[PDB]
Each structure stands twice: as C-alpha cells, then as structure tokens.
Amino acid sequence: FGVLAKIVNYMKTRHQRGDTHPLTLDEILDETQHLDIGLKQKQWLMTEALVNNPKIEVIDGKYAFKPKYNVRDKKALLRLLDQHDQRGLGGILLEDIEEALPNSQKAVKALGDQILFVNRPDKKKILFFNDKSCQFSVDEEFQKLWRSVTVDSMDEEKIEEYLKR
Amino acid sequence: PAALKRLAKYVIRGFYGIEHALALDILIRNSCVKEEDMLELLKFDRKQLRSVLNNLKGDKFIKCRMRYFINYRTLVNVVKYKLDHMRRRIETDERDSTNRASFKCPVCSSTFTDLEANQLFDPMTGTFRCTFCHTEVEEDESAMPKKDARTLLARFNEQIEPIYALLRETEDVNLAYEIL
C-alpha cells in the first residue's frame, strides 16, 4: 500500500513541476527508484492499484495525472452559467489551482470578465463565483436599506389595506 | 411570471448583499429543494447558508414544508409590499421633517421652536434669552434638512424615484398578467 501513495505523491509533484504527460508504470518506478520494489508489488500496482483509482487518466496506453480523468479544461464553464435555470458551479479555489495553472495570471483578465471572489469556507479559503448586472437604485444603499428591510410586524394584510384606502 | 422573477431579482440586488442573492437564484425557480440541495449545488457553509436562510425566512420571502425532513419554497409576492414598505421608509425621509420655525442656542446647543420664542425673549435687552444658560438664539438647522448635506439625500430620493420607476412599471405590467 504505502508505495502507491509514494507513486501518487510523485505524480502530484510532476503536475506541480509543470507536466501531465502519460508514463508507463516502469518509467515511474525507475525515476522513483522503486523498479526493484518486487515483481509481486509491481503486478499488484499494475492490475489492481491503478485500476481501483477511478480518478487516474488512462491515455496513450499509459497512466497520467491524477485527480481528474475529464473536465481538466482549466477555465470556467461560462456556457452553463449563461443558462439562469441551470447555471451552477462555484467551487473551491484550491481545486482550480490544483487543476493546471496559478490563479493570478488568468484572474487579471477575469477580474474584468467573469470572476468574483468570496472569502468563504473560512478566511484562509476563497470561493470563486461568476458575476451579474446593475443595481435597482443609486443610494448610500446601506443606510436606506437598513431602514427598509421592513415590516415583519403583523397586522400586515391590514397595513396593505390601510395604504390602499 | 418571468418579469416578476426579474423584478424580484432587481429589488434584492439593490437591497441585499451578493451572498443572499446567490442563495436567492436557485430559489427563484421556486423549486421544492431543501437546504441539503442548496448546500450541495452552491457549496455554501451549512451555518452560513442557514444564517442566510434565517435572514430570508425572517424576511418572510420563504415558506417551508416539514415532512423531520424539511423543504423550502418562495411566497414571491410578498414583494409588492417590500417595494411599498421600502418606499414608505424612503417617504419618511421625504415627508416633512424640516420643522419650520426653529432656533437653537449656540452655548447649550439645545434645540427650540417658534413656540419657545415667546418665553425665551426678554424685553429689557430687546433680544432672545435662553432658558438656563441665557444666550441669544440664531436659527436652528440641527438634524434637519439644510444646505447640501441633507439635500444630497433628498436628491438621493429624487434619484431613487427614476430607478424604481421601471420596477413600478414592472409592477403595473404584472398587474396585467395577474389575470393570467
């Protein structure tokens, strides 16, 4: 078992170094000096361990990096977001940084395109969401707003009536 | 009721923060979804979402179904009042609060009206004498409409009326679809 977690750590380091190209199990075991980890461990790793992981990318007869076998498009699904009856996906910034590239380079363009940052899940965490249109009045908003939240205080079918009369 | 859904979306935008608006969007569909579904799709924190839900429930925008299993849905029309209540609030600022006839004594900084003049006067000096600290009074203008500082707000109201005009018009067209 522990050698498979060393392989997943090496493959995670390969994406952090800049690469998602597929390799054979041999090329992985050679670089990590696990080539002699034992033929029984190599066979189990090949025919059960890289088979029991549903997140492994199988491509070119080989195995590649690593948490996503699909939808590694490294940009937001704007097209789904266009559809206000089905638009839905904000996630965690950590998955998006994990996916491909640092946020900042993409974000400079995105701060004036689609992205909104919310400090959610905690101060150390950020959630990204897509944005919107204009407001419904130019006022100090918050002063007026705090007075106009309003009338949760009963006899309200009668306060609609009282206004109507 | 697409126009009403837009109309609701506009009024909350002017009012509420984006955190509430984001919860509100899945809700606009008036679907029989629960907090778990809104938690799953939106990824809001359970405590934080529930706070927003508590703000919305308290706001009366929501009605629920308890099976316990709990389900949440909109009442959506509590909106006409929301506009009408907010306008009222805006009207309190619009309704006369100038309190015409109005002096104040610079020493004690207290406030006074026309009614207090007939007692705050003193004939031997031919001028106004305050009640206790005895000093001249020279107009009021305290917490009252004045030169530009308050008037920026009265103008704000002047500015608010055109921005909710289309929404009232939205309310008017909605009054036509009511038959429907």
Please indicate whether, in this complex, the C-beta atoms of B18 and A116 are within 8 angstroms of each other: yes
A17 and A60 share one domain: yes
d(CA B61, CA B73): 9
B39 and B11 share one domain: yes
A65-72 contacts at long range (C-beta below 8 A, 24 or more positions apart): A65/A11, A65/A12, A65/A14, A65/A15, A65/A19, A65/A20, A66/A8, A66/A11, A66/A12, A66/A15, A67/A98, A68/A99, A72/A20, A72/A99, A72/A100
d(CA B139, CA A124): 55
A62 and A83 share one domain: no
B87 and B108 share one domain: no
B2 and B64 share one domain: yes
R_g of chain B computed on alpha carbons: 26
Which amino acid would we find at residue A148? S
A103 and A155 share one domain: no
Please indicate whether, in this complex, the C-beta atoms of A90 and B42 are within 8 angstroms of each other: yes
A27 and A79 share one domain: no
Most distant CA atoms of chain B, gap in Å: 82
- Tally of CA atoms within 13 A in the half-sphere of A70 that contains its CB: 1
Q: Give the DSSP per-residue string, chain A.
A: -HHHHHHHHHHHHHHHHT----B-HHHHHHHTT-TTS-HHHHHHIIIIIHHH-TT-EEETTEEE--S-SS---SS--HHHHT-TTT----EEHHHHHHHSS-HHHHHHHHTTTTEEEE--SSTT--EEEE-----S--S--HHHHHHHS---SS--HHHHHHHH-
Give A36's contacts (C-beta < 8 A, 6+ positions apart). Answer: none
Closest-CA distance, B115 to chain A, in angstroms, reads 31
In the three-class reduction of DSSP (H, G, I as helix; E, B as strand; rest coil), residue B62 is classed as strand
B43 and B114 share one domain: no
Contacts of A96 in chain B (CB under 8 A): none
Contacts of A149 in chain B (CB under 8 A): 15, 59
In terms of CA atoms, which chain A residue is nearest residue B59? A152
Helices of type H across chain B: 2-15, 18-28, 35-42, 46-58, 78-94, 114-120, 151-163, 165-177
In the three-class reduction of DSSP (H, G, I as helix; E, B as strand; rest coil), residue B111 is classed as strand
Nearest to B163 among A116, A132, A138 (CB): A138
B93 and B110 share one domain: no
Please indicate whether, in this complex, the C-beta atoms of A152 and B59 are within 8 angstroms of each other: yes
d(CA A148, CA B29): 25
Nearest to A120 among B45, B82, B90 (CB): B45
d(CA A26, CA A35): 7
Q: Give the DSSP per-residue string, B63-106.
A: EEEE---EEEEE---HHHHHHHHHHHHHHHHHS--S-SS--B-T
Q: Using the 8-state DSSP alphabet, how is residue B150 labeled? A: T
B15 and B93 share one domain: no
What is the tally of structural domains in chain B?
Answer: 3
A50 and A12 share one domain: yes
Where does a domain end: A36, A52, A72? A72
A137 and A117 share one domain: no
Contacts of B38 in chain A (CB under 8 A): none
Contact predicate A147/B153, CB 8 Å: no
What is the tally of structural domains in chain A?
Answer: 3
B110 and B152 share one domain: no
Cβ-based neighbour number of residue A118 at 10 Å: 16
Please name the method used to determine this structure. Answer: cryo-EM
Give A125's contacts (C-beta < 8 A, 6+ positions apart). Answer: A92, A93, A94, A119
Residue B64, domain extent: 1-77
Q: Does B81 touch chain A (CB under 8 A)?
A: yes
Resolution number, Å: 3.9
Please indicate whether, in this complex, the C-beta atoms of B85 and A148 are within 8 angstroms of each other: yes
Residue B124 in tokens = 């031997």
Residues preceding gaps in chain A (C to N > 2.5 Å): none
Contact predicate A25/A62, CB 8 Å: no
Q: Using the 8-state DSSP alphabet, how is residue B49 labeled? A: H
Which one, of B14, B124, B121, lies nearest residue A140 by Cα?
B14
Residue A144, domain extent: 131-165
Phi-psi region of A33 (alpha: psi -120 to 50; beta: other; left: phi over 0): left
In terms of CA atoms, which chain A residue is nearest residue B167? A136
Phi-psi region of B143 (alpha: psi -120 to 50; beta: other; left: phi over 0): left
d(CA A51, CA A58): 10
Please indicate whether, in this complex, the C-beta atoms of A88 and B41 are within 8 angstroms of each other: yes
Could you give the C-alpha distances from B83 to A33, A102, B50, B89, B172, in angstroms and in order? 71, 44, 25, 10, 13
- Between the two ends of chain B, the Cα-to-Cα distance in Å is 9
Residue B72 in tokens = 């949440």
R_g of chain A computed on alpha carbons: 26
Residue A86 in tokens = 């089905």
A2 and A60 share one domain: yes
Please indicate whether, in this complex, the C-beta atoms of A150 and B89 are within 8 angstroms of each other: yes
B61 and B8 share one domain: yes
B58 and B131 share one domain: no
Interface of A with B (CB under 8 A): 84-85, 87-88, 90-92, 116, 118, 120-121, 127, 129, 132-141, 144-145, 147-152, 156, 159-160, 163
In the three-class reduction of DSSP (H, G, I as helix; E, B as strand; rest coil), residue B127 is classed as strand
Q: Does B83 touch chain A (CB under 8 A)?
A: no
